[PDB]
């Protein structure tokens, strides 16, 4: 069905090196500490150890390369891809940001051959903006069009 590409593994390899900040090869609680404090978090060495227990299937207090890739190579996120929401995002995203804005929608309805006033477009993006609000993304379009 789908063909995996070495590109994915390279992605997990870039994040791995970004975490280890001491040339070690293994991610400890100290290195990870600076990994969460340099991004946007201020937890502690104790709570951190707890977040490491789930990323440790041996009992060593650290993570290796086969555990970091086997954990993030499975799921990590959710990006449904169907022939329906695929063409839709391809026609609503002509700038590149990869997001549908109330403005673009206005220029898309007039091109197809219809006539919607700014009031109709803004109200539309609002009914589909359940988690974005102000902007829409892939997931939103997949959960706004399909619904029992
Ligand atoms: N979670 C968003 C902020 C960080 C983004 C980069 C890291 N992304 S992550 O949160 O998936 C992640 C990466 C590497 C080690 C982790 C350990 Cl030891 C525990 C929990 C998550 C970990
Ligand atoms: N290959 C299948 C393509 C299916 C396209 C369906 C388009 N369905 S739609 O015209 O109702 C529509 C288009 C673009 C954005 C929308 C937002 Cl943000 C909210 C509500 C409706 C939206
Ligand atoms: Ca190290
Ligand atoms: Ca381990
Ligand atoms: Ca766009
Ligand atoms: Ca939204």
Tab-separated table of C-alpha atoms and ligand atoms in Angstrom:
chain	number	residue	atom	x	y	z
A	1	UNK	CA	0.000	0.000	0.000
A	2	UNK	CA	2.445	2.720	1.133
A	3	UNK	CA	6.212	2.822	0.473
A	4	UNK	CA	8.347	4.008	3.420
A	5	UNK	CA	11.271	6.304	2.545
A	6	UNK	CA	14.668	6.667	4.268
A	7	UNK	CA	13.687	10.346	4.697
A	8	UNK	CA	11.606	9.470	7.789
A	9	UNK	CA	14.569	7.820	9.555
A	10	UNK	CA	16.684	10.906	8.771
A	11	UNK	CA	14.051	13.058	10.504
A	12	UNK	CA	14.261	11.025	13.735
A	13	UNK	CA	18.067	11.170	13.438
A	14	UNK	CA	18.020	14.991	13.331
A	15	UNK	CA	15.936	15.242	16.526
A	16	UNK	CA	18.119	12.653	18.295
A	17	UNK	CA	21.334	14.654	17.762
A	18	UNK	CA	19.475	17.858	18.728
A	19	UNK	CA	18.703	16.305	22.138
A	20	UNK	CA	22.114	14.834	23.072
A	21	UNK	CA	24.115	18.011	23.830
A	22	UNK	CA	27.363	16.412	25.077
A	23	UNK	CA	28.576	13.939	22.404
A	24	UNK	CA	27.454	10.722	24.141
A	25	UNK	CA	25.160	8.769	21.782
A	26	UNK	CA	22.658	8.115	24.593
A	27	UNK	CA	19.983	10.526	25.893
A	28	UNK	CA	20.199	10.898	29.694
A	29	UNK	CA	17.947	12.910	32.042
A	30	UNK	CA	20.474	15.774	32.171
A	31	UNK	CA	20.784	16.243	28.400
A	32	UNK	CA	17.014	15.901	27.983
A	33	UNK	CA	16.709	18.496	30.756
A	34	UNK	CA	18.407	21.113	28.556
A	35	UNK	CA	16.304	19.814	25.639
A	36	UNK	CA	13.067	20.787	27.429
A	37	UNK	CA	14.464	24.022	28.938
A	38	UNK	CA	15.755	25.292	25.568
A	39	UNK	CA	12.403	24.738	23.813
A	40	UNK	CA	9.540	25.915	26.069
A	41	UNK	CA	9.375	24.010	29.378
A	42	UNK	CA	10.740	24.238	32.938
A	43	UNK	CA	10.097	20.846	34.561
A	44	UNK	CA	12.547	19.298	37.068
A	45	UNK	CA	15.058	16.417	37.186
A	46	UNK	CA	12.553	14.271	39.127
A	47	UNK	CA	9.427	14.737	36.975
A	48	UNK	CA	11.723	14.370	33.957
A	49	UNK	CA	12.875	10.919	35.134
A	50	UNK	CA	9.172	9.967	35.146
A	51	UNK	CA	8.820	11.003	31.486
A	52	UNK	CA	11.844	8.753	30.821
A	53	UNK	CA	10.303	5.639	32.441
A	54	UNK	CA	7.892	5.377	29.488
A	55	UNK	CA	10.812	5.727	27.045
A	56	UNK	CA	12.833	2.953	28.750
A	57	UNK	CA	12.047	-0.754	28.206
A	58	UNK	CA	15.120	-2.138	30.018
A	59	UNK	CA	15.573	-0.310	33.355
A	60	UNK	CA	18.773	1.685	32.758
A	61	UNK	CA	17.575	5.283	33.305
A	62	UNK	CA	18.471	6.333	29.737
A	63	UNK	CA	17.426	5.920	26.083
A	64	UNK	CA	19.432	4.478	23.176
A	65	UNK	CA	19.197	4.692	19.371
A	66	UNK	CA	16.975	1.609	18.778
A	67	UNK	CA	14.489	2.852	21.402
A	68	UNK	CA	14.303	6.413	20.046
A	69	UNK	CA	13.723	5.253	16.458
A	70	UNK	CA	11.406	2.327	17.323
A	71	UNK	CA	9.246	4.694	19.420
A	72	UNK	CA	8.944	7.656	17.002
A	73	UNK	CA	8.984	5.501	13.819
A	74	UNK	CA	5.594	3.951	14.688
A	75	UNK	CA	2.997	6.717	15.169
A	76	UNK	CA	4.181	10.082	16.730
A	77	UNK	CA	1.365	11.997	14.935
A	78	UNK	CA	-1.691	11.544	12.674
A	79	UNK	CA	-1.908	12.769	9.055
A	80	UNK	CA	-4.754	11.004	7.193
A	81	UNK	CA	-4.272	11.065	3.401
A	82	UNK	CA	-7.289	10.293	1.165
A	83	UNK	CA	-8.002	11.079	-2.513
A	84	UNK	CA	-10.752	13.427	-1.263
A	85	UNK	CA	-9.076	15.733	1.297
A	86	UNK	CA	-5.939	15.473	-0.901
A	87	UNK	CA	-7.273	17.423	-3.904
A	88	UNK	CA	-9.188	19.738	-1.558
A	89	UNK	CA	-6.046	20.977	0.228
A	90	UNK	CA	-4.300	21.201	-3.168
A	91	UNK	CA	-6.918	23.714	-4.401
A	92	UNK	CA	-7.215	25.694	-1.119
A	93	UNK	CA	-3.428	26.042	-0.641
A	94	UNK	CA	-1.930	28.115	-3.480
A	95	UNK	CA	0.455	30.305	-1.423
A	96	UNK	CA	2.555	27.547	0.236
A	97	UNK	CA	1.974	28.050	4.003
A	98	UNK	CA	-0.113	24.836	3.775
A	99	UNK	CA	-3.196	26.319	5.489
A	100	UNK	CA	-6.663	27.499	4.391
A	101	UNK	CA	-7.408	31.148	5.297
A	102	UNK	CA	-10.792	32.913	5.030
A	103	UNK	CA	-9.201	35.171	2.377
A	104	UNK	CA	-8.035	32.369	0.044
A	105	UNK	CA	-11.456	30.683	0.310
A	106	UNK	CA	-13.000	33.943	-0.965
A	107	UNK	CA	-10.756	33.950	-4.073
A	108	UNK	CA	-11.477	30.230	-4.648
A	109	UNK	CA	-15.300	30.431	-4.671
A	110	UNK	CA	-15.239	33.267	-7.240
A	111	UNK	CA	-12.851	31.337	-9.523
A	112	UNK	CA	-14.905	28.107	-9.552
A	113	UNK	CA	-17.845	30.129	-10.928
A	114	UNK	CA	-19.992	30.897	-7.857
A	115	UNK	CA	-20.728	34.050	-5.819
A	116	UNK	CA	-20.237	34.013	-2.022
A	117	UNK	CA	-20.017	37.278	-0.035
A	118	UNK	CA	-17.292	37.775	2.609
A	119	UNK	CA	-19.982	37.005	5.212
A	120	UNK	CA	-20.490	33.468	3.831
A	121	UNK	CA	-16.744	32.634	3.605
A	122	UNK	CA	-15.847	33.875	7.112
A	123	UNK	CA	-18.816	31.963	8.580
A	124	UNK	CA	-17.681	28.823	6.718
A	125	UNK	CA	-14.094	28.720	8.020
A	126	UNK	CA	-15.638	29.341	11.471
A	127	UNK	CA	-17.894	26.249	11.311
A	128	UNK	CA	-14.876	24.082	10.373
A	129	UNK	CA	-12.425	25.776	12.764
A	130	UNK	CA	-12.937	23.576	15.815
A	131	UNK	CA	-9.272	23.558	16.938
A	132	UNK	CA	-7.674	26.237	14.706
A	133	UNK	CA	-9.995	29.234	14.834
A	134	UNK	CA	-8.457	31.905	12.630
A	135	UNK	CA	-6.869	29.237	10.390
A	136	UNK	CA	-7.576	25.675	9.150
A	137	UNK	CA	-5.237	22.707	8.557
A	138	UNK	CA	-5.368	19.146	7.148
A	139	UNK	CA	-6.964	17.385	10.164
A	140	UNK	CA	-9.704	20.047	10.445
A	141	UNK	CA	-10.702	19.582	6.775
A	142	UNK	CA	-10.844	15.787	7.296
A	143	UNK	CA	-13.090	16.024	10.388
A	144	UNK	CA	-15.287	18.894	9.116
A	145	UNK	CA	-16.363	17.342	5.789
A	146	UNK	CA	-16.838	13.764	7.064
A	147	UNK	CA	-19.389	13.319	9.884
A	148	UNK	CA	-22.292	10.938	10.623
B	1	LIG	N1	7.072	17.775	23.094
B	1	LIG	C1	7.302	19.030	22.394
B	1	LIG	C2	8.568	19.746	22.872
B	1	LIG	C3	9.796	18.886	22.553
B	1	LIG	C4	9.901	18.693	21.039
B	1	LIG	C5	11.180	17.920	20.709
B	1	LIG	C6	11.133	16.544	21.372
B	1	LIG	N2	10.047	15.694	20.889
B	1	LIG	S1	9.428	14.490	21.979
B	1	LIG	O1	8.730	15.241	22.978
B	1	LIG	O2	8.710	13.563	21.154
B	1	LIG	C7	10.833	13.708	22.715
B	1	LIG	C8	12.074	13.632	21.955
B	1	LIG	C9	13.265	13.010	22.531
B	1	LIG	C10	13.238	12.447	23.872
B	1	LIG	C11	12.007	12.503	24.651
B	1	LIG	C12	11.945	11.959	26.002
B	1	LIG	CL1	13.308	11.226	26.765
B	1	LIG	C13	10.709	12.036	26.767
B	1	LIG	C14	9.517	12.660	26.189
B	1	LIG	C15	9.543	13.215	24.843
B	1	LIG	C16	10.770	13.150	24.059
B	2	LIG	N1	-11.288	15.208	-3.884
B	2	LIG	C1	-12.393	15.658	-3.048
B	2	LIG	C2	-12.383	17.162	-2.790
B	2	LIG	C3	-13.539	17.516	-1.860
B	2	LIG	C4	-13.567	19.024	-1.626
B	2	LIG	C5	-14.729	19.362	-0.696
B	2	LIG	C6	-14.821	20.876	-0.524
B	2	LIG	N2	-15.943	21.190	0.362
B	2	LIG	S1	-16.384	22.852	0.627
B	2	LIG	O1	-16.444	23.407	-0.693
B	2	LIG	O2	-17.582	22.776	1.405
B	2	LIG	C7	-15.064	23.635	1.521
B	2	LIG	C8	-13.878	23.923	0.732
B	2	LIG	C9	-12.694	24.534	1.333
B	2	LIG	C10	-12.674	24.871	2.747
B	2	LIG	C11	-13.842	24.602	3.571
B	2	LIG	C12	-13.845	24.967	4.982
B	2	LIG	CL1	-12.487	25.687	5.783
B	2	LIG	C13	-15.026	24.723	5.789
B	2	LIG	C14	-16.214	24.107	5.205
B	2	LIG	C15	-16.245	23.730	3.798
B	2	LIG	C16	-15.077	23.966	2.952
B	3	LIG	CA1	24.938	11.859	26.162
B	4	LIG	CA1	16.577	2.218	27.795
B	5	LIG	CA1	-2.698	28.401	1.660
B	6	LIG	CA1	-9.309	25.800	13.644
